[PDB]
Amino acid sequence: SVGEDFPSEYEQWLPVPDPESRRRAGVLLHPTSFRGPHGIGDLGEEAFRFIDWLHSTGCSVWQVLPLVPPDEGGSPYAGQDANCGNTLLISLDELVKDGLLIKDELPQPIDADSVNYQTANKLKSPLITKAAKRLIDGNGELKSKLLDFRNDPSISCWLEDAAYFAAIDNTLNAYSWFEWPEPLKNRHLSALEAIYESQKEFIDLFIAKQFLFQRQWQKVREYARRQGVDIMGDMPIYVGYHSADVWANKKHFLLNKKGFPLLVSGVPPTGQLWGSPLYDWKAMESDQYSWWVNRIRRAQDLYDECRIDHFRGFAGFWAVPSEAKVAMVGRWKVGPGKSLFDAISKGVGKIKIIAEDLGVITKDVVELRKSIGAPGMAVLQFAFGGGADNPHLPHNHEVNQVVYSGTHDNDTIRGWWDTLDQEEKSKAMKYLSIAGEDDISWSVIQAAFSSTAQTAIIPMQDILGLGSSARMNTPATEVGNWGWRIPSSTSFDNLETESDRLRDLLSLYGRL
Amino acid sequence: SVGEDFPSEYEQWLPVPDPESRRRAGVLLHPTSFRGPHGIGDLGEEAFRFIDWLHSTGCSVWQVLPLVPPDEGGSPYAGQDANCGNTLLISLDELVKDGLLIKDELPQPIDADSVNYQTANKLKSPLITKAAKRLIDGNGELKSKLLDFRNDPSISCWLEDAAYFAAIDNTLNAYSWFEWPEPLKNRHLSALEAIYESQKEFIDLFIAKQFLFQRQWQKVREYARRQGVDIMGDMPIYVGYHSADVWANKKHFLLNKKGFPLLVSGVPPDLFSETGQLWGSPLYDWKAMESDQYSWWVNRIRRAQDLYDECRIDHFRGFAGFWAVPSEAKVAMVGRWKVGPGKSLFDAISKGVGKIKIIAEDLGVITKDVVELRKSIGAPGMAVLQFAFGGGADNPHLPHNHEVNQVVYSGTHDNDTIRGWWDTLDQEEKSKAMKYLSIAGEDDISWSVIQAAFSSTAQTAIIPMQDILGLGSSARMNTPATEVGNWGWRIPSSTSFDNLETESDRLRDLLSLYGRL
Ligand SMILES: OC[C@H]1O[C@H](O[C@H]2[C@H](O)[C@@H](O)[C@@H](O[C@H]3[C@H](O)[C@@H](O)[C@@H](O[C@H]4[C@H](O)[C@@H](O)[C@@H](O[C@H]5[C@H](O)[C@@H](O)[C@@H](O[C@H]6[C@H](O)[C@@H](O)[C@@H](O[C@H]7[C@H](O)[C@@H](O)[C@@H](O[C@H]8[C@H](O)[C@@H](O)[C@@H](O[C@H]9[C@H](O)[C@@H](O)[C@@H](O)O[C@@H]9CO)O[C@@H]8CO)O[C@@H]7CO)O[C@@H]6CO)O[C@@H]5CO)O[C@@H]4CO)O[C@@H]3CO)O[C@@H]2CO)[C@H](O)[C@@H](O)[C@@H]1O
Ligand SMILES: OC[C@H]1O[C@H](O[C@H]2[C@H](O)[C@@H](O)[C@@H](O[C@H]3[C@H](O)[C@@H](O)[C@@H](O[C@H]4[C@H](O)[C@@H](O)[C@@H](O[C@H]5[C@H](O)[C@@H](O)[C@@H](O[C@H]6[C@H](O)[C@@H](O)[C@@H](O[C@H]7[C@H](O)[C@@H](O)[C@@H](O[C@H]8[C@H](O)[C@@H](O)[C@@H](O)O[C@@H]8CO)O[C@@H]7CO)O[C@@H]6CO)O[C@@H]5CO)O[C@@H]4CO)O[C@@H]3CO)O[C@@H]2CO)[C@H](O)[C@@H](O)[C@@H]1O
């Protein structure tokens, strides 16, 4: 009532910081990059030591690339399945702790300054198989947990299809499932029954290996939670054609009557022809988008938060005739928009998505992102072309946003600086606080941390001040990517200086 | 619909910047500070030269302090009236252009490094009176404009009361209107009639002088608009007791039956103040104001719209909740918090006046209701960089904590200059500032802070002229709670707007870099 006395509590009725608005920082590091003797990083001791080091710095987020089974080139983005984990991340030493291997069975260490997948597979897979076999042949607590995992409806809704798909793909010599004999191609019940009988061992071992992955990943996730670290995963909007995701869900994709894609993914200008099948969004509507709901439920199972690559495809997507050799001959199609996210909310509750929204995007993309409250991205490596309206410049950043120095698709800051255009360089020198070129990565890190963006993420390569040899991926190249590992001599114990320097900057910019 | 082709225009359907979100910068400079021969700055040629210089820098806002008639110490915040203009800002040269003075009547120039009000009044007021007399005695276009001004209902709703109040205050030897004889104190109709008869000349001259102020100020404002410069004024939430604002609107204030205030304004002791502050202004009877749809405040805002593009309101928190001290108290601690009018006030203003552009002065420990009210009306608050380096990294004045809908200052008229502030800064705050700011020579510390203001996400950055000129503590405009030596700063006599090209270039370069052009 106007003019009357307030209660005496008035003076303590102060604004409270919303815990959901807490400023934070983190590190982008894929677990393949961890040090160790078995040819690849894994979910063992180095994952826990990394989490400890991250906690020591004051960082509270760890971002990974997709954890799916990669292709032969190591790519997390050409996954063999959208929901399975990369079994080569399984730690042999952790299997010893679980009693499925004995210490004596572990292999002699190998030099692998970079990940060679074929070498890691040859070394580790026989032992992961032996552990899985011991698991299925036993009858204890661990076997009982395997059964709970296998019979859990939110696991079984993708795992059985994944395991049958893999067993068929293992048994058949064929390019893709389009070439499979009709009863297998089209999942006839008695054909699938016959596959279970004839490939029973393969199927049970595949499922056990997914269990072992789940168990180890979940231990890592819990450990991160215990040390005040959230994990942010990565989910590409599209899935590959030759996958259980498509084969077991044909009606949910734009395929012809023979199961061949009608239209494929890409972006216009030469633009890019990615060549993935496209979702049949109208068909998906008819079962309240169950396929996407299930995918998000799996993402929730693995990660605290998730980046979706090419988030713009939910508003509008480029569709290329499947017979085309290039992208420029396609059409833009209307995406599902907020009705998809409404269905997800109804199905799964609150989600934490990060929209990858880089490049030329349309007004509908921005409106959709805002309507669901998702942050977009700023990337400082992109800030110094054009004028002062570039959205990647700090003064243009938004609070509900994730700022990066760069992503896995960019060179390291040092490498980027090396090849940078003179006009962009002179510009960067005005915006950034730069001392020696040796320390350019720390200039950019400081600019990221000084941002109003609620979350700042730095690649481990930039914290280590590494050059172009440490770049994780060069887009559109098909060899020499995804192999970077933390140098063999750099232990998390050897990074106290870097931790102190990070912590000092987080303190200064209110991210602790 | 889903899955179908978009039109072929799709790829050009790009996000458009909202023109209302445009980043900008500006300068805080009160017109008394302009150079010139008559003891005080004025609304003549220096105001136009300043606008031209400001335009050249890329700035698009000019902020002033209240333009009201100040007290004898020069304070714009102890105004004699809430709506009148300070007639000492009237340019004598502009009166010559209007044919109301001849060049020969102008006084010999005086050296006045700082504004002395008594000196300016003695020099200028007789000539402003002579001009006003010539105006009222004439017939012609200018006389016709005077009549239009006087008979305009949105002028007359405050000007007639102001003019009668001033005529009585002139005629009577009394401390305040509380001491006036009852028929004058209480505005008896036949007493007011008698005053118009006996003080007709005074009243007509007062009104003419307000006309001359309005004419000159409106020319400055129109010139600014032509050069792409918005003017931001300043309106203190409360008004003084000895004013037409109170005397002519007694039922709108918390007064007793004798017209003495029941409760007066202040703030209580704080995290940052052991004793609070007793300001001692009368308080609004907000309940009574609600009953006529806040007509007094609607009229005040209409006058603010007439003078300014946008307006800062000092102690905006008083609209949500206000501290009320028994008027007999010698100490602020004795009061209590009362419920303010909240958004119903702003709704009434919107109905009465349309869209307004207010800036909320919201500094210090404020309550959740203040923040919610400010946000509900879309008003920006303030950040002041001089306050940013105490406490930890959650300090709201630090750039990383700035908001878009906000006005960032290096400092205000109540703060020292940046150079002066730096000189006396606490070693712990200084070390902190040295980490956050980009500093070259310490002589150029004001430019470090300017850069930090411009680099902010805050939509508007405002810099005192003293900081552009890199001046020290001698150029501080006001020291709060002191009663002598304030409000006097003038631009050094040597420094002309024709010789600030380097400063203009430097500002423009920073505005370009930070997207404020
Ligand atoms: O003419 C005859 C006449 O002459 C004289 O009168 C004249 C005056 O002398 C003259 O100056 C002039 O006055 C006028 C002014 O010019 C004009 O500007 C106007 O001024 C008004 C304001 O309008 C009004 O709002 C008010 O302002 C007051 C405040 O009410 C008061 O509280 C106080 O605030 C200041 C602080 O004290 C000061 O410390 C600082 O605060 C900073 C702080 O330092 C900084 O750290 C930061 O703080 C954060 C903090 O970092 C963050 O962590 C958090 O804290 C939380 C904790 O962490 C938690 O643990 C938990 O506790 O919660 C807290 C809180 O959430 O949040 C903190 C807050 O954000 O930021 C702070 C700032 O935000 O600055 C404060 C603001 O200045 O002091 C101000 C200033 O005084 O009053 C002034 C007037 O005093 O109007 C004036 C006219 O009325 O003209 C006069 C008339 O001529 C004579 O005096 C007179 O007697 C003669 O008759
Ligand atoms: O395994 C077998 C397989 O191997 C290869 O395939 C693999 C790939 O090689 C490999 O890279 C990997 O790809 C995946 C990738 O790793 C993932 O991150 C993910 O990437 C895709 C993205 O999700 C998706 O969105 C898209 O992104 C591309 C965009 O669509 C394009 O438009 C384009 O956009 C970039 C611009 O070209 C570029 O210029 C830059 O733009 C910035 C400007 O520089 C800057 O000025 C600023 O502009 C402002 C202005 O300043 C302002 O005034 C105003 O006008 O606004 C503008 C715009 O805001 O800002 C711009 C940025 O905002 O950056 C743009 C963003 O990058 O390129 C994008 C990047 O490519 O496609 C990505 C993939 O290309 O998913 C990938 C796919 O899965 O894995 C592959 C699979 O293994 C072979 O290629 C295969 O053939 C082989 O079969």
Curated annotation (Swiss-Prot), chain B:
It catalyses: Transfers a segment of a (1->4)-alpha-D-glucan to a new position in an acceptor, which may be glucose or a (1->4)-alpha-D-glucan. Its EC number is 2.4.1.25. Its main location: plastid. It comes from the Eukaryota. Disruption phenotype: Increased amounts of maltotriose and leaf starch. Keywords: Amyloplast, Carbohydrate metabolism, Chloroplast, Glycosyltransferase, Plastid, Transferase, Transit peptide. Gene3D superfamilies: Glycosidases. GO terms for cellular component: amyloplast; chloroplast. InterPro entries: Glyco_hydro_77, Glycoside_hydrolase_SF. It is found in: Plastid, Chloroplast; Plastid, Amyloplast. GO terms for molecular function: 4-alpha-glucanotransferase activity. Pfam families: Glyco_hydro_77. One of its GO terms (biological process) is maltose catabolic process. Belongs to the disproportionating enzyme family. PANTHER family: 4-ALPHA-GLUCANOTRANSFERASE DPE1, CHLOROPLASTIC/AMYLOPLASTIC (PTHR32438), 4-ALPHA-GLUCANOTRANSFERASE DPE1, CHLOROPLASTIC_AMYLOPLASTIC (PTHR32438:SF5). Chloroplastic alpha-glucanotransferase involved in maltotriose metabolism. Probably uses maltotriose as substrate to transfer a maltosyl unit from one molecule to another, resulting in glucose and maltopentaose. The latter can then be further metabolized to maltose and maltotriose by beta-amylase. Required for normal starch degradation in leaves. This is 4-alpha-glucanotransferase DPE1, chloroplastic/amyloplastic. It comes from Arabidopsis thaliana.
